[PDB]
Write a protein that binds this DNA or RNA. Structure first.
Lengths: 200, 87, 43
RNA sequence: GACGAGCUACCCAUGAGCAGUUUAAAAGAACCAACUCAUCUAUGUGGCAAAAUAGUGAGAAGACUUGUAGGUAGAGGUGAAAA
RNA sequence: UCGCACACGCUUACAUCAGUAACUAAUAAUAUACUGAUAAUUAACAACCAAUAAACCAAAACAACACUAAAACGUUUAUUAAUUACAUUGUUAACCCAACACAGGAGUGCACCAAGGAAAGAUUAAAAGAAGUAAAAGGAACUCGGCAAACACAAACCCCGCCUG
């Protein structure tokens, strides 16, 4: 599961610098994270997917901690939501219903089957494209309303947007809300994160 | 014409079952063993080869730096009961 | 000190014959060198 | 139209290096050899040397030093930014 | 006093013999760095080699552990397949980059000695210069400034910049 990440340092395939002040930091091992969550398919069956959270771990590529998930027939890594506890059952279902059943902050559900007003994160842009939104620590979205075949989401940037109903999203808020309260204290830590001093 | 023998030249003393030769650079030890066994009809226990790079010397008339042809030397260990002595 | 720090690998890789063949301009370099009658196309 | 990042500037990949002493847990502080710099003075001024030597001084677990393998060039690159 | 080994490199400088009017090492002595001819060590040393497909999480600091910067190199299972893989190159020669036999230059491991170099032309004891040593009494009276310099660092007060760079 752990993969070796290649640091560009502002260098593209040509070798030119498209971004100033990036490099000189510690290396990183990219951990595979599932932004899909809509794919039970590997079990070769339409049925739902049950999960168990083994442990919560830190990630190099993101400020948000990553949670270790095991179904016992498989092991996948996700992004740890706030209030997440070790040994919690995580239910995932792509089924559509009007029942509107409340789920734990670790679960994931489509925007349509999910009640309005609940704080959510990891929202996908287009179906099957994975979640492109709110992967950062401490943030979260909120469902404003439902219009036609779409659902209106309010992003942490306060911008009101329209996201497709079939897009799956995880309820709750992302953990590590104190990340923004972290004081660097020196340029050295910035050099450790891979951020070079910018005179531009 | 590819090989020749040298005895009184080397300062190292190995009179017992050790003979020195000058060989071509391309020739492997095995082919040397087989050739020395079949042509001269003598047993060969071992072969140790090394390459001697040629020295260089200039020419004052044309003002041109030249180099002597490179060489390769071999040391053969024959069967027990033989002694190589030559001057 | 000096501007020169001798390396054989870098010299053979960068200034080598194969490098001259890999580019058309290098072929033009070898071209003008043979046109000038150079005894050595590479140092 | 081409040659140049074996100097140097930055960066990528892969390795290595940085005694000892006081100390409450502290790769934590301060001093001080290597190493990395060139504060002041003197000498040297067709020289030992087209960037030096001697005394002295700074950093010296850090934004540190360094080997090797690579990338970025003139209607530009790079630049903790001095034209 | 500071140097022996591993290199990247450097292309017989080196070892033996012989000869040095002449050139070559600013001369002689001579020669590891001149001419001419003739010697130039191995390997179990260093370079050069199986294709793939699966399994696995919980960094390194003589580290159960902890911390942070979220971690050089690691192993196992299965399938296919390979031959003389008793081979091929190199080392061990002398050191090299700066026009020079140039007080300047660099990577790695461990000694500081039983390793290594001798300020290897000689006189004169002037002025003057460079480095160094000492001084009666005064103790900054010098000077742009306690620069320099032997002895030491006790105390005072400001401007600017936080600071480590």
């Amino acid at each position: 599961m752990p993969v070796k990440m290649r640091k560009s340092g502002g260098r593209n395939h040509t070798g030119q610098i498209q971004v100033h002040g990036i490099g000189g930091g510690h290396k990183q091992r990219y951990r595979m994270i599932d932004f899909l969550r809509f794919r039970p398919e590997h079990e070769s069956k339409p049925g739902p997917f049950e999960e168990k959270v083994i442990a919560v771990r830190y990630d190099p590529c993101r400020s948000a901690d990553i949670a270790l998930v095991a179904g016992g027939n498989r092991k996948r890594w996700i992004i740890a939501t706030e209030n997440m506890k070790a040994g919690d059952t995580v239910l995932n279902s792509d089924h559509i219903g009007r029942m509107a059943v409340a789920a734990r902050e670790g679960d994931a559900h489509p925007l349509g089957a999910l009640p309005v007003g609940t704080l959510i994160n990891n929202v996908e842009s287009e179906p099957g494209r994975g979640a492109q939104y709110i992967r950062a620590a401490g943030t979260c979205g909120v469902l404003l309303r439902k219009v036609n075949g779409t659902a209106i989401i309010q992003l942490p940037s306060k911008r009101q947007m329209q996201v497709l109903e079939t897009c799956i999203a995880t309820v709750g808020r992302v953990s590590n809300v104190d990340h923004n309260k972290r004081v660097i204290g020196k340029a050295g830590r910035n050099r450790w994160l891979g951020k070079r001093p910018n005179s531009g | 014409x590819x090989x020749x023998x040298x005895x009184x030249x080397x300062x190292x003393x190995x009179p017992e079952d050790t003979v020195q030769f000058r060989i071509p650079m391309e020739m492997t030890r095995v082919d040397l063993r087989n050739y020395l066994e079949r042509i001269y009809n003598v047993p060969v226990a071992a072969v140790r080869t090394r390459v001697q790079y040629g020295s260089n010397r200039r020419r004052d008339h044309r003002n041109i730096r030249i180099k002597k042809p490179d060489y390769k030397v071999a040391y053969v260990q024959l069967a027990l009961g033989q002694x190589x002595x030559x001057x | 000190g000096n501007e020169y720090q001798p390396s054989n690998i870098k010299r053979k890789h960068k200034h080598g014959w194969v490098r001259r063949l890999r580019t058309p301009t290098g072929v033009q370099v070898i071209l003008r060198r043979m046109h000038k009658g150079r005894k050595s196309l590479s140092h």
